[PDB]
Amino acid sequence: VLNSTAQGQLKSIIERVERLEVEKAEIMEQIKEVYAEAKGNGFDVKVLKKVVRIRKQDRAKRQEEDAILDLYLSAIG
Amino acid sequence: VLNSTAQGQLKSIIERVERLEVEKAEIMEQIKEVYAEAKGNGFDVKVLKKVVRIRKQDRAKRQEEDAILDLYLSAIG
């Protein structure tokens, strides 16, 4: 059995996660809409998605290079 | 070569998709934070996630039952 406080906690957890998952689905739908718009303008959607992935990978690489920089500087001092 | 209007279109597409993908990542992080909070309260996160999936499946089932209802009613009229 779950006591009163725990039942409240559970209900709050489910409520918040479900609201966030609705927002996430809304965002995903908007991304789909932007790509559909692009397709309408004559763009290649598969290639656009690849452009986005490549740029994401570049940003990730730069962040890890910042981490590595802090590691080296730390080690040197 | 891409003409002026097409270059503007491309830049707008990438800009909007990347902003939306940042929002999506923010939402995913918030979901993680809610589950971390739940774990702190003594809840089983794996089981919570399963609760959320089950409820999502129930909602999906109800939507498809509404679709099927419209199909049957349509066919009958």
PDB file of C-alpha atoms in Angstrom, chain A residues 2-3 5 12 15-16 18-21 26-27 30-31 34 37 39 43 45-46 50 56 63 69 71 73 76-77:
ATOM      1  CA  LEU A   2       1.108   3.561  -0.774  1.00  0.00           C
ATOM      2  CA  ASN A   3       0.555   6.197   1.928  1.00  0.00           C
ATOM      3  CA  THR A   5       2.140  11.470   0.519  1.00  0.00           C
ATOM      4  CA  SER A  12       2.553  14.228  -9.675  1.00  0.00           C
ATOM      5  CA  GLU A  15       1.229  13.992 -14.555  1.00  0.00           C
ATOM      6  CA  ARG A  16       4.498  15.855 -15.196  1.00  0.00           C
ATOM      7  CA  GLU A  18       2.937  12.829 -19.453  1.00  0.00           C
ATOM      8  CA  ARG A  19       2.701  16.618 -19.966  1.00  0.00           C
ATOM      9  CA  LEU A  20       6.386  16.710 -21.000  1.00  0.00           C
ATOM     10  CA  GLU A  21       5.847  13.785 -23.393  1.00  0.00           C
ATOM     11  CA  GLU A  26       4.301  18.513 -30.370  1.00  0.00           C
ATOM     12  CA  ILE A  27       7.937  19.504 -31.074  1.00  0.00           C
ATOM     13  CA  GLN A  30       6.640  20.785 -35.758  1.00  0.00           C
ATOM     14  CA  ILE A  31       9.976  19.420 -37.044  1.00  0.00           C
ATOM     15  CA  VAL A  34       9.226  22.229 -41.293  1.00  0.00           C
ATOM     16  CA  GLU A  37       7.488  22.754 -45.989  1.00  0.00           C
ATOM     17  CA  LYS A  39       9.972  19.423 -49.490  1.00  0.00           C
ATOM     18  CA  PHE A  43      14.534  20.647 -51.088  1.00  0.00           C
ATOM     19  CA  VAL A  45      14.580  16.191 -47.026  1.00  0.00           C
ATOM     20  CA  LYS A  46      16.944  13.234 -46.546  1.00  0.00           C
ATOM     21  CA  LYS A  50      21.902  14.710 -42.886  1.00  0.00           C
ATOM     22  CA  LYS A  56      24.999  18.295 -34.480  1.00  0.00           C
ATOM     23  CA  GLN A  63      32.108  20.263 -26.702  1.00  0.00           C
ATOM     24  CA  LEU A  69      41.142  21.055 -23.151  1.00  0.00           C
ATOM     25  CA  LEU A  71      41.622  17.921 -18.834  1.00  0.00           C
ATOM     26  CA  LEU A  73      45.148  22.278 -18.729  1.00  0.00           C
ATOM     27  CA  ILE A  76      49.563  20.678 -16.702  1.00  0.00           C
ATOM     28  CA  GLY A  77      49.031  23.109 -13.809  1.00  0.00           C
TER      29      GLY A  77
END
